[PDB]
Write a protein that binds this DNA or RNA. Structure first.
Length: 304
RNA sequence: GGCAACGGUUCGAUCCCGUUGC
């Protein structure tokens, strides 16, 4: 009876996303757990953790939009593009308000970006950061990303604060590093927090410290930690909330769960769909409309 | 399940996800 669901963790500053994920996995005594998009050690914010069967649908969040609040230090460029790196260039901040306004605008909409060597992108079976730490640079192609919104928050002294809503795989550190160059003074990230992933309620986000306080409380009150921990989870199908839901009577789901495509009344002409059973509307997995217009099973939840 | 190659994700995921091979 493993736990299935999504925990919206507020990642602690300085901790790697994997380390945060593993601590949560242990707190929930889960058999399987994965996160839906890493945050740098320096960053904090929403790190969705899929537990149990929920990991099967992590791709929908890995590919979703995200929103960040960032503060850049102007006048200094670092090798990592953030405060955890080494300063490689230092120049005077001399741009004008008009120049800043123009530079920021070049990052709005559909743009292209060459990611930092300090990233988890793969190159011949190894992460780019592995080469970076060895003092080895490798060729990287520019990747298309979309900045849905970029809000200028403030420019005070050598600090520039922005809020960015972007598509999956967008490197804020690179937008900032690139911006620093366009501004003629260089820049690096000194503050970064992911405010949200997709449409998840920011109010459901919980800190690692709060999880530990609940574990402590459960012991204090002599009750299963699950009684206090499980209510914090979003449904295991929440990662696929964007897709239409199709319900099948139990007489049809039995074949569906055996790998057979099935016909149903309410079903879209195409695309992926969440599939539920009987009246209780139990989620049994993801399906997909095939040629015959049938709902074919794609990724199902284990039965038992 | 598992193993491997390759790719993903905002950087110290062997660990989560995807493609392919066994």
């Amino acid at each position: 009876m493993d736990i299935n669901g999504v925990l919206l963790l507020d990642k602690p500053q300085g901790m790697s996303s994997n380390d945060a994920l593993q601590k949560v996995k242990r707190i929930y005594n889960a058999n399987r757990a994965g996160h839906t998009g890493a945050l740098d050690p320096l960053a904090t914010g929403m790190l969705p953790i899929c537990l149990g069967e929920a990991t099967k649908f992590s791709q929908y969040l890995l590919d979703s939009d995200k929103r960040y609040r960032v503060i850049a230090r102007l006048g200094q460029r670092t090798d990592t593009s953030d405060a955890d790196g080494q300063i490689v260039e230092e120049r005077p901040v001399t741009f004008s308000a008009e120049q800043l306004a123009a530079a920021l605008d070049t990052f709005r909409g559909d743009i292209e970006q060459i990611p930092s060597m300090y990233s988890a992108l793969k190159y011949q079976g190894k992460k780019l950061y592995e080469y970076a730490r060895q003092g080895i640079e490798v060729p990287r192609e520019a990747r298309p990303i979309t900045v849905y919104e970029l809000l200028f928050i403030r420019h005070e002294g050598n600090e520039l604060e922005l809020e960015i809503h972007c598509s999956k795989g967008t490197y804020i550190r690179t937008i900032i590093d690139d911006l620093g160059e366009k501004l003629g003074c260089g820049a690096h990230v000194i503050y970064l927090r992911r405010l949200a992933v997709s449409k998840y309620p920011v109010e459901r986000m919980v800190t690692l410290e709060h999880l530990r306080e609940l574990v402590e409380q459960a012991e204090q009150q002599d009750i299963p930690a699950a009684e206090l921990l499980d209510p914090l989870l979003m449904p295991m199908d929440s990662p696929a909330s964007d897709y239409p839901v199709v319900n099948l009577p139990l007489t049809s789901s039995v074949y569906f769960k055996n790998g057979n495509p099935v016909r149903t009344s309410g079903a879209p002409l195409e695309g992926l769909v969440r599939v539920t059973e009987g009246e209780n509307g139990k989620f049994i997995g993801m399906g997909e409309i095939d040629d015959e217009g049938r709902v074919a099973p794609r990724r199902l939840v284990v039965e038992y």
